[PDB]
Write a protein that binds this ligand. Structure first.
Ligand SMILES: O=P(O)(O)OC[C@H]1O[C@@](O)(COP(=O)(O)O)[C@@H](O)[C@@H]1O
Ligand SMILES: O=P(O)(O)OC[C@H]1O[C@@](O)(COP(=O)(O)O)[C@@H](O)[C@@H]1O
Ligand SMILES: O=P(O)(O)OC[C@H]1O[C@](O)(COP(=O)(O)O)[C@@H](O)[C@@H]1O
Ligand SMILES: O=P(O)(O)OC[C@H]1O[C@](O)(COP(=O)(O)O)[C@@H](O)[C@@H]1O
Lengths: 317, 316, 316, 317
């Protein structure tokens, strides 16, 4: 065994001491890591012990209980809960966490990789905590990230500093630092979008896809890749580069993905890694929320690529 | 639980019915040991290249476990130029063609990857040679894949059906979770790498158009393409749909190798009630002339593969 | 590592040499599945009685895995009054006497406990009965124990020797770590429950005195007594020494049952070069008349057991 | 899975918030738990990957690195290091940990259970930290305990509050609370001592052993049990009751076991569980240390039993 392992907790702490900051954040993310290991083990034995609905409810309960017990949060927004959860006085701390407990729970049946997505805001107001504290623009995130439960469990953490990847060591139950200051490729070679929705795409998306399939400058076309699980397609976009798109369509006129705990965590991870995240109009990280479960279009990925689609959005405006 | 049905118990009970020798049980028992080790390697593949090196170790491990089973005589690998002829001391009756880690490139993006295998019976009486591997997929005795994803799954197809076994990590034992899987007749998803749109033959090109913009105004299809044959085929099995990797002209014979990628997947599909075609003939009836031969493959739910076959008729 | 010697590979290669049927490999493969499950149960036995309930589940699990191996016909358990006769559908040639979780009381103090087993071959032609289990330990075909301690260890004794296999938890596979273990001729430790000092027969009483206060002024012995036969016997095997559980008058026949505690441990010892005696005869040559019969046992390094035998002579 | 797991970290924190105390202790014990899981996995695969010496050196390095990185310690005493380790200024915190990294490393070859023992002192002086801070009497321990690597890994933690047992869940890598406020049986029925040393025992020990083997009041004798691994025999004494004795003998005139990190951690655990720990003369927890690797006789266990031996020590004085 290595006698000098850089666990997530140690990393956060060495960076925290460096800024003589918070402390509470380490109790927060450590509790989150317990929930994440418990959900990873549960997914890994999923069919031996439904998935779509039930396992996600159990994940929701576990992430809420551990976050309340970290003594680091005051307001919690979940995909599952209609209203925001306010923590008991004696257990309160300074943070607002917005989380999706199990993105894609349906996908378990098909053994498609899925994940946990989270956003961490610092409660800025001096008032009694309320869902109002959750409605900050994405640019206000203190920390955000995701856990991908795939062939290995990866926890990706973006903080002010940049993006750091951690992998769960199954043997000792610790997320270990494996990639240190991640920056996405300036342009990529893959585009990820559900083309079953082609009949309802806006002219800008449509022009871009055919420009990737039939490249104007008589170059090689882009490869398509679409796992159908946001955490899987954004993690591939981050490591390999390219662009991931979930624009608006018929049944999803304002996009499908929820702004506070899917779009904004991924957008903060993506911009801290040097990439871009836009609606096609504004940058996702500037949208002041209205409803905790508000939806947004998201286009994220390699800077050169997102820019090409923004230029095409300018043309048809 | 007290009475657990493991892959060994299942294959042994089945094997008894054949009044056989025990060699197939020896073989799949060995294979499971390799599958568990590759699973642990990929589960911590990152705590430290992992494409060339991990597919090499995966390949050496599978050949070693198969040779020691006393069940094999010819072994064909994605990784090896020629067939491996098992030493006389260790020889048995089965031929195994396998891809040890399909899509090993994908490990960096944590994409589910897996091991694919097809098992034949050597029927002839002369020395083992790669010609014993050159049989049509119609003659596979057993075939399957192990998926290294959020859970490790072994899907096994034999004459009596398709069954799914999940690796219980606590006891390191594959437990039977799904018995005689049948695919649904029609599905909602089409998988293909549409980035090759310029190169598609017009029959493919028409069908894709038809799935996005339905003529009978029916609901359009969802598109899913993990980029890993085991993950795309496994979803097609569980959820129904159609998976396609036809000739993309750059690959005029298709990309996927016949003996260890197309034929195992095709045997699984047919045993589950799906179809597998090149668009011109059923892949299980192609007679191989080279152990590393490629084929185009279109497989999945019957109605959807039939629909594409009709569009192929109408393109003359 | 690419070529790993598992318990299955080892037993299969050995079995080939006997020109046998595969049943012993079937049997020990099944047994390993039970041993891995009991190991995981004890490793989290506490995260929640665990004596009566855990020894019951351990017993049901072992009987289930043995019946499905198609290798057994009579099964004798510490937990069951009568022998279990395997159904005709599932019968094979071996008789198995086993203690499923020896010292299950000890789990609360996290004392290492384990499974002990002795395997006979039914030689007669009439219906299986518990009389096929009533053979001398000299006739065991194989015997051993699995120790659930800081690591799970399977010590296996057969005609060719004693070998030790460690459970690798990552791949759930018993790996050969020690080959043909031999015990050292003389050791430094004596194990006995000295709390019974009033009840010891004067030969035991003299030897203990002699080990604490050496007449030839030699260094005294260390005393170790875990209170668990598998842990005490395993240390005696690895480190040398003498382990004793003679008649403590309250138990005038000794405590430990002959067929599934004394005889497996004694076969292991003799195969490793040690001795096992009641103080009056070798336990492996005792002819059993009841499947739940007890014996006194003194086993360990040859010189030390011989020394105690001489003191037994001198007590007339 | 349980959606409300009481991990060691959560427990310590709910008790810590209750006293609005330290914080640093949670970073300390959390780091210690990482080291303990890594040593548990290493012991569990010990013969597949010598034991006596080497694995204990690697354990020593790992416990030192994680304690330095918890930003909670200033002085560390180890069995392995001749002098005490002083932490770097930027990494210092208020605690002194005295630890035995792998008690009984020899015993691995025989698969005898072994453990990690630790004592946690708060640096009381205002001076620059030095080994002088480690030399406090045992009564000054803030927290002490042990990890037993046996058929299961158990972490036992005694703090001001009492004794709490935690068990490592192999599946998620978390010590889970399994026994909550442990108190030892007033009298027991087992005595644990290496009787190979009989030739050199003092008359008090000698009289007591024969009184356990031949009970004066014509009762049933005591059972003997001696694993030869302090952590195993003290853990059995704690759960089952009885008395564990390592008095002085010929090669060990002041006892064998080291005072700061074997005797005092076990003595604090034992007295917080209602038992006693004595030299035969003074209580172990009152001995002011002199040398960091000073030795002590220890007799610990059920109150009624230790008292009987102390009465016998009075008689021959
Ligand atoms: O991205 P395209 O060119 O469609 O290829 C992906 C296919 O290639 C694969 O063979 C994976 O490639 P490798 O197995 O050669 O690593 C198959 O598993 C995928 O479906
Ligand atoms: O404490 P004493 O009476 O010597 O008995 C301990 C012996 O009993 C045991 O049979 C354990 O008891 P159980 O197996 O009946 O639980 C054997 O494993 C021990 O060596
Ligand atoms: O089939 P579609 O609409 O492309 O869905 C893909 C998107 O839907 C999601 O699976 C949402 O999942 P759920 O709706 O079950 O929460 C995302 O993870 C993913 O990006
Ligand atoms: O054989 P003995 O002297 O009774 O030794 C037992 C004592 O020695 C120890 O094993 C000490 O171990 P080490 O000397 O290897 O550090 C204690 O754990 C135990 O209580």
């Amino acid at each position: 065994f290595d006698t000098n392992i850089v666990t997530l907790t140690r990393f956060v702490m060495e960076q925290g001491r460096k800024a003589r900051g918070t402390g509470e954040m380490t109790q927060l993310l450590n509790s989150l890591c317990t929930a994440v290991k418990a959900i990873s083990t549960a997914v890994r034995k999923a069919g031996i012990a439904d998935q779509v609905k039930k396992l996600d409810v159990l994940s929701n309960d576990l992430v809420i209980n551990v976050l309340k017990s970290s003594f680091a949060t005051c307001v919690l927004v979940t995909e599952e809960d209609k209203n925001a959860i306010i923590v008991e006085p004696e257990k309160r701390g300074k943070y607002v966490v917005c989380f999706d407990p199990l993105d894609g729970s349906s996908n378990i049946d098909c053994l498609v990789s899925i994940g946990t997505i989270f956003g961490i805001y610092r409660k800025n107001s001096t008032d009694e905590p309320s869902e109002k504290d959750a409605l900050q623009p994405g640019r206000n995130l203190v920390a955000a990230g995701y856990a991908l439960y795939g062939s290995a469990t990866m926890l990706v953490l973006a903080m002010v500093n940049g993006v750091n990847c951690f992998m769960l060591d199954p043997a000792i139950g610790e997320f270990i630092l494996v990639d240190r200051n991640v920056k996405i490729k300036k342009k990529g070679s893959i585009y990820s979008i559900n083309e079953g929705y082609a009949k309802e795409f806006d002219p800008a998306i449509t022009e871009y896809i055919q420009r990737k399939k039939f490249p104007p400058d008589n170059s090689a076309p882009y490869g398509a890749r679409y796992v159908g699980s946001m955490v899987a397609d954004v993690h591939r976009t981050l490591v390999y580069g390219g662009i991931f798109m979930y624009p608006a369509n018929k049944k999803s006129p304002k996009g499908k993905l929820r702004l506070l705990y899917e779009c904004n965590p991924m957008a903060y991870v993506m911009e801290k890694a040097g990439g871009l995240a836009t609606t096609g109009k504004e940058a996702v990280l500037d949208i002041v929320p209205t409803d905790i479960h508000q939806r947004a279009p998201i286009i994220l990925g390699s800077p050169e690529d997102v820019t090409e689609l923004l230029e095409i959005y300018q043309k048809h405006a």
